[model samples]
Target: MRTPLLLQSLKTRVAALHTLIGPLASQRHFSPRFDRQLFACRGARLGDYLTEAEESLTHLEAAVNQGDATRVAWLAERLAAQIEALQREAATATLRRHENAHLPGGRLHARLAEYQEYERRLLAMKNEREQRYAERHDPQLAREITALDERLTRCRTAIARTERALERITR
Candidate 1:
């Protein structure tokens, strides 16, 4: 009879459902580090999606075990739609991340370059001041060199901070 074949099909569908839902149900998905905005972009919260998925899974399990072929088939179709929706959301998120990481004229890159140029100019000026101080032994030249050193340090730190921000955005 078709009952045995239908039961096999139902088992396969349930296994597929588990695979699809496992990642979303994990602790990592619920963590703050996870991008909830991905789900929010679809006009629903991740928690709401997870709740609906869990409810569907529960119903599907009961229907399969009760050997109701019609119920199993119907639930399987609904679950398939849900899985497709999840996949689409994931694809969109990936595309958005890629676009952001590779912007033509990203502000972070521009700012980092600006700071690096500032550092180079400051170092050159400090070296000139040192040379003048060495020849003349002028206290004013020494003070100016020290001030340039401080500015150089601040510029280097700004560059480092921008680099870290760039890394975070790309990741």
Candidate 2:
């Protein structure tokens, strides 16, 4: 004969699984979005999608290892579908970003350098302007450049922070 606790646990497990899958008479999951579209989404930006999908897989594996067989099987199946979608999204984004970020040559800092070396170039350019104006040591130009540099650096830093935040959400 089965122990009462074991039988009750099995009953609960099957009940919860059935409810989650949702062919029930009550509380229909009336979402037009399928599992692929739902879980495939990451954040507001397309860049977020792939990383989240990877994290979703990571969390699922951890859950399985931590001993949730029922959840593991369900999440594993869902994550498999999401994986292919994420790959497709990432591949397309890479191609598009590559095209859009293509640099066009400038006096120095051109758009063509989408992520290339602009190191010291912008400072050098500003300094050149100051030199042309006979103000290499002029405090005003120095102050202006300092302020601009701070603003630009802060902007870039903020962008990095946001990207990192997106990466860290699953944790």
Candidate 3:
């Protein structure tokens, strides 16, 4: 029972990592040169971090199926740490927006972009949950949708704050 739950958790974490990595990996600015530069600056590459986590997930799945509780625990801890590291890196990397390279309010613009992207994704996730709930009327999905709504509010607040800051600086 515990193993089943642990496996599900690992799958969710890896799926999240994939969502964060997939878009960036294909972007022109995230090519190998840029990745190497990021590695030099931040001591890790997003793709590499994701790969390690995926490998850990594979091993953890095997351990769970084999009833190796100790191995599963160890792998789970390692995978969680890797996911956290990747998420931190992703947040920082997204804030390094290159669209307004020479503008005085460039960083604020970067922040605004990040928040907008966050808002977009939150809405997408919320819609997904709503669809699921509509079909199944699951209480759990309703709860998840509510949580996403709260997050969307916070995301919108940050977007507003960043827009205000940019306006002030430009004025």
Candidate 4:
């Protein structure tokens, strides 16, 4: 049942990784070098991290679909590990922002801090859901997940406009 899902996850991961390279390569060619450098060191790193994290998450999600306990457990551990590593990676970025607030990209770096914190919470919920699914043996979790998924998706979509595409209008 679930084996087919792994292939879909594989396809998603490969496609995403390929899609991400385009933006990185584009940034590599942009002018002034300073802005590109900033994007390379910060934005691009975050993008790569997000893309890879999504890839791993897709795999784990596929694991859930397959209902293979061993595979699900394995993916859960790996997924949690990757998320933990990303949290640490986000921390240094926070410290760097504080240390270098006078830089040209300081304001955006500040916002990245906010983004990082929100992201931490997002990952925490996701990780917790996986843990609960693994340990609680609750079938109704799916119904709860579906309802929360709808609400969260709408909230996130609105937040995306406020945070990602625009700097203001979030009040």
Candidate 5:
């Protein structure tokens, strides 16, 4: 009865690996380039890791034949962790998809764009000030300079607020 149960558990877990692995490989979120760049060598590859896991099932099944419950249980835990890790990786991809979705929602994409545009305008304002030869003496130039300082402060504050908002959204 022990041997029968061990073998059945191994079989079911190995099959579960396929159910998780198949979608991970096929999902568009996981680019081939990304995976390849992320990991080095055969041992690092998910498919290779999975093959070794399935191979362990065979070895554990043999241990079951020898009536070794300890070894069988250890292998069972190892296979379970591997399968769970794969499930997490798939879920991470799904979350990335949500971020890629229309925002004003996930990640607040427009906030970043607005921050950059503010930066551009601030830089332009500085350049214009620099080009004015009489800027030091002219009252109008002094007023404009004060206004530029206010604008810069306001822009920086807006950027900081957006940063905080993004942090909260992610949290």
Candidate 6:
């Protein structure tokens, strides 16, 4: 039996899934604007969605391995729909890229790349910060943290510079 709170949460997630799919559906074709549009998306929530999707796939795999027909069928049905949507999105994006193949430069693509690099650096900085705060026994940790702090400052500066460049490009 689905508990009340659990049912409420389920409703919330279904709505969220629709939210994710809605834009993808409406924007049938991909353009350079795709990245910029998603730049304003809930980045952390997307990560959570990725994690949950991956975890669900593993659970489905185990159910299949154990020959649990009921569980397998249930997971398979939903997974099939999700998988097709994912494939469609990917295919459309690739087609769009191909359509724009005659373009002279990948200016927007390079700018988006800078954003990706910035995110990686930010994640690394976050990990370093967490480690520095959590580790009390390591005497050399302070030095490492200091180095990471310097790197983080540089990374942030570079991101700001690139962001300015992108702003000009957009304008």
Give each model's whole-structure lDDT.
0.46, 0.39, 0.48, 0.46, 0.47, 0.43
Return the TM-score for each candidate structure.
0.29, 0.27, 0.30, 0.44, 0.28, 0.31
Candidate 5 stretches with Cα past 4 Å from truth are 1-46, 97-171
The candidate scoring highest on lDDT is: 3
Q: Which candidate is the best by TM-score?
A: 4
lDDT of 2 at 102: 26
lDDT of 5 by residue, 1-171 (tens): 432456656556654554344434422444343334433446423446444543543454444433444654555455455445444544454465465443323233232223334544553564355445343544565556456656655766566666766665663
lDDT of 1 by residue, 84-130 (tens): 54344444434543664445323433332333345445545644445
lDDT of 2: 0.39
Q: List the residue pairs that clash in candidate 1.
A: none
* lDDT of residue 99 for candidate 5: 51
* By TM-score: ranked, best first: 4, 6, 3, 1, 5, 2
Give the winner by lDDT: 2 or 5. Answer: 5
User: What would the per-residue lDDT of candidate 2 be over residues 1-171, giving only the tens digit for each residue?
Assistant: 212446444544532332233221122335342335435453332234324633543454444323444653454344334334433433443443455332211111121123212323443454345445442445565555456445545654466566555544634
Candidates by lDDT, descending order: 3, 5, 4, 1, 6, 2
**Ten-residue region with minimum lDDT total, candidate 3:** 37-46
Query: At residue 129, what lDDT does model 4 achieve?
Result: 73
For model 6, the superposed segments whose C-alpha errors exceed 4 Å read 1-46, 63-67, 98-171
lDDT of 5 at 66: 39
